């Protein structure tokens, strides 16, 4: 079954894997993000509501005045997208909020309200999504890429001993908040723990440990295990457990109850541990010398003397034993201190702590944060508190809290926005465990530690920053309290927030200039992920690890689609089925497999969980009942793919396409190409140029319809129905009675843009592709966009290619092109350029634009009107004049044609400031625009009152007035006909009551349009009026273009050759493109050969259809033939029966197939060779696909048959005239007197320093000297040579490089004396 829109041309596809989850909306990542930014959220956890709740309410210092938020809404936009684009204004909506002012009496208990005031307050203008999902700032279209950054949380990184000579592994811990100051912990080579804040100087860790009101004893208790000693008769005994007997050497014999358990002198043994735990003995005597290395755990003082005998963190000795024994300290507490299990790293830091009172510690912290400041103790306390406990100056956000809890094996995933002492303690414990081997470090490249930050979060953060600024300002204002003197609107200033938002959208690292030169590039640019920008790596700081692809990248980011050059691996695009999680993590679809059955159940899995299950392969053979046909299948668990049984499998990929992006997806037969050339081909396909007439590619992917529909460049049928009126610019659709609205249903209107400038000087055109009186349904395709055909993507053309060397015209990589190609204009494109003229108000009279120009011939004015504007449709050439703008001296500063470019004028636009007289040409363009608008409006009227007067006539029929009179009587006369019949009069009189309302609202809306058109356009300050001119140029293929294929086999056109000299087959059909086969084995991208062979298969059917169509044979024999073609293949999912199709439909499909049957191919479920050969057998072509040829030059038969076929060839955006230029003599830089750079400035090339060394390497001296002195900067000398060349003498003059003197003065500008010497 199919809808009518695709019944025009059904494209056959191969593939055996049934589809379970179709491609979703390609833009759901972007639009649905910004969607979550504007609606009213009762939860108060998204967008504006969440931002406001974090700032409101605000209290005064006195506490008597308060400001609260109530509600907010978005005002309607002033214009639409088209008007904003035309007028160069930001498509935005006003922000409406309701504010609350509360006053509390100073002489009343807290909470006593003095007065209340509610008032709507203007906030500013916020830009809104286009229906396509873009931005408009100044008549231009910009898009916001989605930033990918390090997920807030905790990481444990290892330097692998790179910075140390011995290579000892160091482990460092980093905690990164969502917003605030950072924090780091490290191990020195000396095996000690240190802390640092904000990438500053290393500091001992324990400084902060006691900063939280921790005594040394508490720290030691937390960080170590206690060992207890009991003083028996001149002896000490210790309570021993077997578990604590790890990695120890028995210095003395271990024995209890008089029986020897462990020998003396050698290392411990496991069997001794087993026998000791079997005996279950705890207390054992210990020699005194065995304790010569034990550090006391706690403090010990004498009750009598009152002096400290020995505090914690000091080594004990026999004399200390004597004091503790004589003081009655029978129980001795020590640390376990097992270097192989629990290293005494903390104690070593305790031995180097400068202080312990925590007050000098706070002083040291204060000095650390800001050097050279008074050590004020309360200031230090405040700095610490608002640096690591501030609710506002520090935050971890919800996602950071969840990551922190998960990393530290915590259960609850919800917490506050600040840290805690227990958190830091646990971080230290885990770091110690990592040092001791417990646990394992994490990976930075793992997607479980990175997240995507969409445009919504960017807008939220910028708006929050602006709100913080404005609330600080209003807090300062309200500090000067008043007795309700002011109205709650004056104390707020919208300028900071508005400026911040507008500047972030306009000029920012992420607000890239979008390039809609063709739908595919637009889509792939919208779905691009960048690691640059704020809170991310830079172009240079990036290392070799981030650029690399990670084993967890599967299904989430395309491994083969990314720009190549100075930034590789950072601009990787999102995959097809990828979608964002609520927290902001990437997840992919999967199918649950139970009992060896693959059901249709779909789950979304994030990165981390992917390491806990078993994942199958997309192209895994399956039965009809979900059972793997064989018990041994290929699956991956953790970065590794190995065989597994049919029962261990849990999840399987939904489809094959979920590994590449759309750009890679459009590459046909990708599964037989190298990654490098696949990447090159995808990137080049991104840079395609619209064709004059679109043609469907013969070999496709299958998602071309999806990519064409999802991109907002082709008008889509919003509602089903039938076509009523057709036009090259407008489309009228009458809805069906099923989809009609209960009130004022009417019809629908679509306006098609015609030749509108793109963002890279390419032609944007919309093509109506439907006939009159044919039904349409919801979601169909009505108007073909640029590079689009019948709702199918169509970038380039399909040419007859033949891989064969030919007289060296394709020596290395070039392409030979027959003039037949340029005969049909199949590659000629349209380029649209802008020339703008600005009239400001300077001195010596304001800039005046008029046809009056002095010292100019009549030829220049011949293409000018009385108002000084070129007529529409003139054939302007280079060096001419377009608009005459002059300024009294009279100074002629009029705009002229750019040098070297010709074209034809298309449209002229004039902008005038408000309160400024509009000249005659402005009046004319205004009046034609108003006439067009009113004609369109009156057309919609005519239809609407057609409906309502049909209703009026129907009403009058039942009322008593005969139907014949209604037809005879005037149409408008129906309303005034006598209302004698009361029962029908109740509505007959009302009919006029709504007709008058409808006409009045039409009148007022028409007046609104008229006043909008007559409204003086806003301009930059000091600018009176500006004029704009559109130029349009046709570009045809000339030797030197950048023309490429779809598999990275780029190249340059060599020379146009007359068609009679091209090779031709026995049938006399010439081949128009001759590639170079030698580039195949080196590139080893064998896929294009298969593409060509399949191309032959397409037209092998194509000609036959043309055969019957020429012979006008019977439908029946035709109908089965197309039926036979579709049925070809092995277990093909797609099957179509033409029996249900009517004769007219069959004929239309056949005639639409005259150019060949399109063939689709899934990227990884592609067709193999057997069916290709079988399809070629259906045609009359040889199975090997290698037919003989004849040379036109010689007329003989080539000894070895060669391969020919159609291949999809593309023209890139690189024209020779865009690059071909040269400079003889022109302007000069005012500073260095050197020639400029850039084609637009008519500047010459740059004498590269590389080739300065290269020239110096040879014996060449005079040429180098000339290049350096005469043609560079010697203004005193180069003039003489210019005169000298005229006389014919090619004599030079040494001179002295002028730019060298400049440097002298620069050095003279310092306290450095430099000067030349004598002769």
């Amino acid at each position: 079954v199919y809808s009518y829109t695709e019944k025009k041309r059904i494209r056959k596809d191969f593939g055996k894997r049934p589809q379970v989850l179709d491609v979703p909306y390609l833009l759901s990542i972007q639009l649905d993000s910004f969607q979550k930014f504007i609606e009213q959220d009762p939860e108060g956890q998204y967008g504006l509501e969440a931002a406001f709740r974090s700032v409101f309410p605000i209290q005064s210092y006195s506490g008597n005045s308060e400001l609260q938020y109530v509600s907010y809404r978005l005002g309607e936009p002033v214009f639409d997208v088209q008007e904003c684009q035309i007028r160069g204004v930001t498509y935005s909506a006003p922000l409406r909020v309701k504010l609350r002012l509360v006053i509390y009496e100073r002489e009343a208990p807290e909470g006593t309200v003095k007065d209340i005031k509610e008032q709507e307050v203007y906030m500013g203008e916020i830009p809104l999504m286009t229906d396509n999902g873009t931005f408009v700032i100044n008549g231009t279209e910009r898009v916001i890429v989605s930033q990918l950054h390090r997920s807030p949380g905790v990481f444990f990184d290892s330097d692998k001993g790179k910075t140390h000579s011995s290579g000892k592994v160091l482990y460092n811990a980093r905690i990164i908040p969502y917003r605030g100051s950072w924090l780091d912990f490290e191990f020195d080579p000396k095996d000690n723990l240190f802390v640092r804040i904000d990438r500053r100087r290393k500091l001992p860790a324990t400084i902060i440990l006691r900063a939280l009101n921790y005594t040394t004893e508490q720290i030691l208790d937390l960080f170590f295990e206690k060992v207890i000693f009991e003083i028996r008769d001149n002896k000490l005994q210790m309570e021993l457990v077997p578990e604590r007997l790890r990695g120890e050497t028995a210095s003395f014999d271990i024995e209890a109850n008089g029986k020897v358990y462990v020998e003396k002198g050698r290392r411990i043994t496991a069997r001794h541990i087993r026998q000791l735990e079997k005996d279950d003995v705890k207390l054992i005597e210990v020699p005194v010398e065995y304790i010569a290395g034990k550090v006391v755990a706690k403090d010990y003082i004498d009750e009598s003397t009152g002096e400290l005998i020995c505090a914690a963190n000091m080594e004990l000795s026999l004399d200390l034993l004597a004091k503790l024994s004589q003081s009655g300290h029978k129980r001795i507490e020590t640390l376990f201190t097992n270097d192989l299990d629990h290293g005494p790293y903390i104690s070593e830091t305790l031995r180097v702590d400068p202080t312990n009172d925590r007050l000098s510690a706070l002083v040291e912290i204060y000095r650390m944060m800001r050097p050279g400041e008074p050590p004020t103790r309360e200031a230090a306390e405040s700095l610490f508190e608002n640096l690591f406990f501030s609710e506002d100056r520090y935050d971890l956000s919800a996602v950071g809290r969840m990551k922190f809890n998960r990393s530290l094996l915590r259960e609850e995933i919800e917490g506050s926005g600040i840290l805690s002492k227990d958190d830091i303690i646990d971080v230290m414990k885990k770091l110690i465990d990592i040092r001791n081997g417990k646990g394992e470090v994490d990976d930075i490249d793992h997607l479980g530690n990175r997240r995507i930050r969409s445009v919504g979060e960017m807008a939220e953060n910028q708006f929050r920053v602006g709100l913080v600024r404005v609330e600080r300002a209003v807090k300062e204002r309200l500090s000067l309290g008043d007795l309700d003197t002011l109205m709650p609107q004056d104390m707020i200033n919208a300028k900071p927030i508005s400026a911040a938002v507008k500047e972030f959208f306009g000029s920012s690292q992420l607000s890239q200039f979008m390039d809609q030169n063709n739908p595919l590039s637009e889509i792939t640019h919208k779905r691009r992920i960048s690691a640059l920008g704020p809170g991310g790596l830079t172009r240079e700081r990036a290392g070799f690890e981030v650029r690399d692809v990670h084993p967890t990248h599967y299904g989430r980011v395309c491994p083969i689609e990314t720009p190549e050059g100075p930034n590789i691996g950072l601009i990787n695009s999102l995959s097809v089925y990828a979608q964002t999680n609520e927290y902001g993590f990437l997840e992919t679809p999967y199918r649950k497999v139970t009992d060896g059955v693959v059901t249709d159940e779909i789950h979304y899995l994030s990165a981390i969980e992917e390491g806990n299950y078993v994942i199958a392969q997309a192209n895994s053979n399956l039965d009809e009942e979900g059972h793997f046909v064989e018990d041994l299948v290929t699956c991956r668990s953790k970065g590794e793919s190995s065989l597994f049984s049919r029962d261990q499998v849990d999840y399987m990929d939904v489809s094959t396409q979920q590994v590449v992006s759309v750009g890679a997806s459009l590459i046909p037969f990708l599964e037989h190409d190298d990654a490098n050339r696949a990447l090159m081909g995808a990137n080049m396909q991104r840079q395609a140029v619209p064709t004059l007439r679109a043609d469907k590619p013969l070999v496709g992917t299958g998602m071309e319809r999806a990519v064409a529909v999802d991109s907002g460049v082709t008008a889509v049928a919003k509602r089903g129905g039938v076509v009523q009126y057709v036009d090259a610019s407008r489309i009228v659709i009458k809805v069906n009675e099923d989809e009609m609205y209960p009130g004022e249903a009417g019809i629908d209107i679509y306006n098609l843009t015609k030749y509108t400038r793109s963002n890279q000087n390419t032609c944007i055109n919309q093509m109506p592709c439907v006939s009159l009186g044919e039904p349409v349904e919801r979601g169909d395709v009505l108007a073909d966009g640029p590079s689009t055909d019948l709702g199918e993507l169509a970038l380039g053309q399909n040419m007859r290619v033949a891989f064969m060397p030919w007289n060296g015209y394709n020596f290395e990589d070039s392409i030979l092109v027959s003039e037949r190609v340029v005969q049909e204009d199949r590659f000629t494109t349209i380029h649209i350029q802008e020339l703008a003229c600005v009239s400001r108000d300077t001195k010596l009279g304001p800039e005046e634009i008029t046809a009056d120009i002095p010292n100019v011939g009549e030829a220049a004015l011949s293409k000018l009107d009385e108002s000084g504007i070129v007529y529409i449709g003139a054939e302007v050439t280079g060096g001419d004049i377009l608009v005459g703008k002059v300024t009294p001296k009279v100074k002629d500063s009029s705009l002229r044609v750019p040098n070297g470019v010709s074209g034809t004028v298309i449209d002229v636009q004039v902008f005038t400031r408000d309160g400024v007289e509009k000249d005659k040409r402005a009046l004319e363009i205004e009046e034609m625009q108003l006439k067009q608008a009113k004609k369109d409006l009156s057309e919609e009227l005519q239809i609407l009152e057609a409906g309502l007067f049909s209703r009026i006539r129907a009403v009058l029929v039942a009322g008593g007035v005969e139907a014949e009179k209604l037809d005879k009587l005037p149409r408008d006369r129906w309303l005034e006909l006598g209302l004698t019949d009361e029962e029908k009069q109740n509505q007959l009189e009302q009919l006029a009551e709504q007709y008058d309302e409808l006409k009045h609202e039409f009148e007022k809306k028409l007046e609104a349009k008229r006043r909008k058109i007559t409204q003086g356009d806003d301009l930059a300050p000091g600018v009176l009026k500006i004029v704009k001119v559109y130029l349009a140029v046709k570009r045809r293929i000339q030797p030197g273009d950048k023309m490429a294929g779809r598999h990275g086999n780029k190249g340059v056109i060599s020379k146009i050759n007359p068609i009679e000299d091209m090779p031709y087959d026995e049938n006399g059909t010439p081949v128009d493109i001759v590639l170079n086969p030698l580039g195949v084995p080196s590139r080893m991208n064998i896929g294009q050969i298969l593409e060509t062979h399949l191309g032959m298969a397409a037209k092998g059917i194509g000609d036959k259809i043309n055969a019957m169509l020429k012979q006008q044979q019977e439908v029946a024999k035709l109908r089965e033939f197309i039926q036979r073609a579709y049925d070809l293949g092995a277990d093909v999912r797609q099957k179509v029966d033409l029996s249900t199709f009517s004769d007219e439909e069959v004929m239309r499909l056949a005639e639409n197939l005259r150019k060949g049957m399109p063939i689709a191919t899934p990227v990884f479920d592609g067709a193999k060779e057997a069916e290709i050969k079988e399809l070629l057998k259906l045609g009359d072509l040889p199975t090997s696909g290698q037919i003989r040829l004849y040379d036109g030059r010689t007329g003989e038969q080539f000894e070895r048959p060669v391969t020919v076929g159609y291949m999809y060839m593309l023209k890139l955006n690189h024209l020779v005239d865009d690059k071909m230029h040269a400079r003889s003599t022109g302007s000069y830089s005012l500073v260095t007197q050197q020639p400029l750079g850039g084609k637009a400035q008519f500047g010459g090339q740059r004498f590269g320093e590389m080739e300065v060394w290269a020239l110096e390497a040879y014996g060449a001296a005079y040429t180098l000297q000339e290049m350096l002195t005469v043609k560079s900067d010697d203004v005193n000398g180069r003039t003489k040579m210019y005169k000298n060349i005229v006389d014919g003498n090619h004599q030079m003059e040494p001179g002295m490089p002028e730019s060298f003197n400049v440097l002298l003065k620069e050095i003279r500008s310092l306290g450095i004396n430099i000067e030349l010497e004598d002769e």
């Binding site: 007289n807 070039s814 030197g1040 440097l1303």
Partner: protein, 652 residues
């Protein structure tokens, strides 16, 4: 600089100077009234900071920033760094009489000439046109000639062709890696808007026709013209300064065509006859009565310079192929016939070409190279060599080999199941097993591809070199290697993890057949790493190049003889097995620090202070000398220069 409107664009220097002068005037006025000393301390300190920032920003600490929130340029900033005055305006400076275009191949062009668009020629030589026009009297005033040239009059093109007959032009491609990046040419006017370039020099430029932009300059003085004509012509640059290897080696289709010429077949139409001379052979081939390559006997004539600079001819019969006789047309007189009787691969022809330069000089060898151009292109066009889907003949055994492969691994994993082996042991076992399987499959597919069966003249199967296209692209050495052939039909091989580890399961599929999802994903690791390495190597390498320029830019040869005997003993490099490099080449092109002593006591094989070349090296080969101490630059005594004999023979 004033931009549009009343606003005036401001530079960083002016703002800093204004700040400093404002503070200076404030302190001056405040001091004149004897202000309290506390104020003057702060004012003096802030003036110190201001003058500090003006002289150098950000050096001391916090840097002054403007509305852009960026540090303003200082005097040191303008003079230091890449954006500084030196590296952007003293060692390199944009110049006039230059143009930029896109390269396009031209076969019909000779070696010493290049194409040029008409627009480029007119724009570049407009100054030359004016003088010539006034000389011929077409126009009297400069303004009249300027009006004439933009009108594209009939005489304009004629005079332009007259004035650019032999006016040399310079061509370079950024980046100019080595000194061959700049070459001179004699332009010829062509149509279009793109530059046409000679093919062979593209190999020297390392420039592929992938859209590379090409640059043109023009010399002005007579001295510059003669300088370019004498030095920068391609005819004077055939041996690279890097090494004696010729830099005009043919590549790709020329090599393919030449290989297709010299390759016999067991039997073909028109085989076994006898022909008077190579001239007749061309007659037979064009008429088509005989195949291009068939073993026949043809009378040929060769000239030898064995006499005292004299050519002597000889005549005989040889058992060669028709194609070789055809190729013998362009061979000059000196070269012996035996050098054009092999398969003539890429290695040989260049070597063969080199031999010509050893004997016939320069003009004969450049004419020979151009003739090789023309003949190779013509016959490659006639060749019709193309790649097809059936060309990649998949080996039959490979499939079942993979089968048997599973066998052993099906056991090895069991060893880990039983615990008799460790993870490392199993890993090494499977690695070795897969490597051996890869080698066996590669050998089998070599064996099946490189040969074919064909009926002899007497009706029996005979084995000869197969005519599968991929084999002509590979064995000839025109492009690709055995690794590519393995990648096409044979299995891919083991694949490396990003860190450096090797995945246990290798890519068992080949590019001719399909690839499952995971293996293609796995292969992307190495491809991405290689692309990143290529992207980031050009930045590090080129910078390295710069550091080599300044260290050794003071070295110029100044005197003929240093007059010292100190040198360095020179021996062939050896690692304990085969010698990495023989003693021959590394002593070539130098001079003897001391006279060569024979193993026979007190015998002087080579006199001291004598240049070395092939006529002397063979004597060392005949005597088989172990080592010789030769003069080197490191030992020359002359200061501020290098002894001429010390550097020895120049490569160019």
């Amino acid at each position: 600089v004033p931009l549009d409107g009343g606003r005036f664009a401001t530079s960083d220097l002016n703002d800093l100077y204004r700040r400093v002068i404002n503070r200076n005037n404030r302190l001056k006025r405040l001091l004149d009234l004897a202000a309290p000393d506390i104020i003057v301390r702060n004012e003096k300190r802030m003036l110190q900071e201001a003058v500090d920032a003006l002289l150098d920003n950000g050096r001391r600490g916090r840097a002054i920033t403007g509305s852009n929130k960026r540090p303003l340029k200082s005097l040191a900033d303008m003079i230091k760094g890449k954006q500084g005055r030196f590296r952007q305006n003293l060692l390199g400076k944009r110049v006039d009489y230059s143009g930029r275009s896109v390269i396009t191949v031209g076969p019909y062009l000779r070696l010493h000439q290049c194409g040029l668009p008409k627009k480029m020629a007119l724009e570049l030589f407009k100054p030359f046109i004016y003088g010539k026009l006034e000389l011929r009297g077409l126009a009297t005033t400069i303004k009249a000639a300027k009006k004439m040239v933009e009108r594209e009059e009939a005489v304009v093109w004629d005079i332009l062709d007259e004035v650019i007959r032999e006016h040399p032009v310079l061509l370079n491609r950024a980046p100019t890696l080595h000194r061959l990046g700049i070459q001179a040419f004699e332009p010829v006017l062509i149509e279009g808007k793109a530059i046409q370039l000679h093919p062979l020099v593209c190999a020297a430029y390392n420039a592929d026709f992938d859209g590379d932009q090409m640059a043109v300059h023009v010399p002005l003085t007579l001295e510059a013209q003669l300088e370019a004509r004498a030095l920068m012509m391609s005819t004077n640059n055939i041996l690279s300064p890097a090494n004696g290897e010729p830099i005009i080696v043919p590549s790709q289709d020329v090599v393919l065509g030449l290989y297709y010429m010299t390759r016999d077949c067991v039997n073909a139409k028109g085989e076994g006859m006898v022909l008077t001379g190579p001239k007749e052979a061309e007659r037979l081939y064009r008429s088509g009565l005989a195949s291009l390559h068939a073993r026949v006997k043809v009378r040929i004539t060769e000239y030898e310079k064995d006499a005292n600079g004299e050519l002597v001819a000889k005549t005989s019969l040889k058992d060669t192929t028709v194609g070789r006789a055809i190729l013998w047309m362009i061979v000059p007189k000196g070269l012996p016939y035996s050098i054009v009787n092999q398969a003539l691969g890429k290695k040989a022809i260049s070597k063969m070409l080199n031999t010509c330069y050893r004997i016939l000089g320069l003009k004969p060898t450049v004419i020979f190279a151009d003739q090789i151009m023309y003949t190779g292109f013509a016959y490659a066009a006639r060749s019709g060599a193309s790649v097809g889907i059936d060309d990649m003949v998949i080996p039959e055994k490979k499939h079942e080999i993979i089968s048997e492969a599973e066998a052993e691994v099906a056991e090895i994993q069991e060893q880990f199941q039983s615990g008799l082996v460790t993870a490392g042991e199993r890993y090494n076992k499977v690695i070795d097993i897969w490597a051996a399987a890869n080698d066996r499959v590669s050998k089998a597919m070599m064996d099946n591809l490189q040969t074919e069966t064909v009926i002899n003249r007497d009706g029996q199967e005979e084995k000869q070199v197969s005519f599968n296209s991929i084999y002509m692209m590979a064995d000839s050495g025109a492009r690709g290697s055995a690794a590519q052939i393995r990648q096409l039909a044979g299995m891919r091989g083991l694949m490396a993890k990003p860190d450096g580890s090797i995945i246990e399961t290798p890519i068992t599929a080949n590019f001719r057949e399909g690839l499952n999802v995971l293996q293609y994903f796995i292969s992307t690791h190495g491809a991405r790493k290689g692309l990143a390495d290529t992207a980031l190597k050009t930045a590090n390498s080129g910078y390295l190049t710069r550091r080599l320029v300044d260290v050794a830019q003071d070295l110029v040869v100044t005197e003929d003889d240093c007059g010292t005997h100190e040198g360095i003993m020179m021996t062939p490099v050896i690692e304990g097995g085969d010698v990495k490099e023989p003693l021959r080449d590394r002593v070539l092109g130098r001079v003897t620090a001391e006279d060569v002593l024979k193993p026979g006591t007190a015998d002087i094989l080579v006199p001291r202070n004598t240049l070395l070349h092939e006529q002397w090296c063979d004597l060392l080969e005949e005597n088989s000398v172990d080592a010789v101490k030769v003069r080197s630059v490191v030992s020359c005594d002359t200061d501020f220069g290098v002894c001429a004999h010390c550097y020895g023979r120049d490569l160019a």
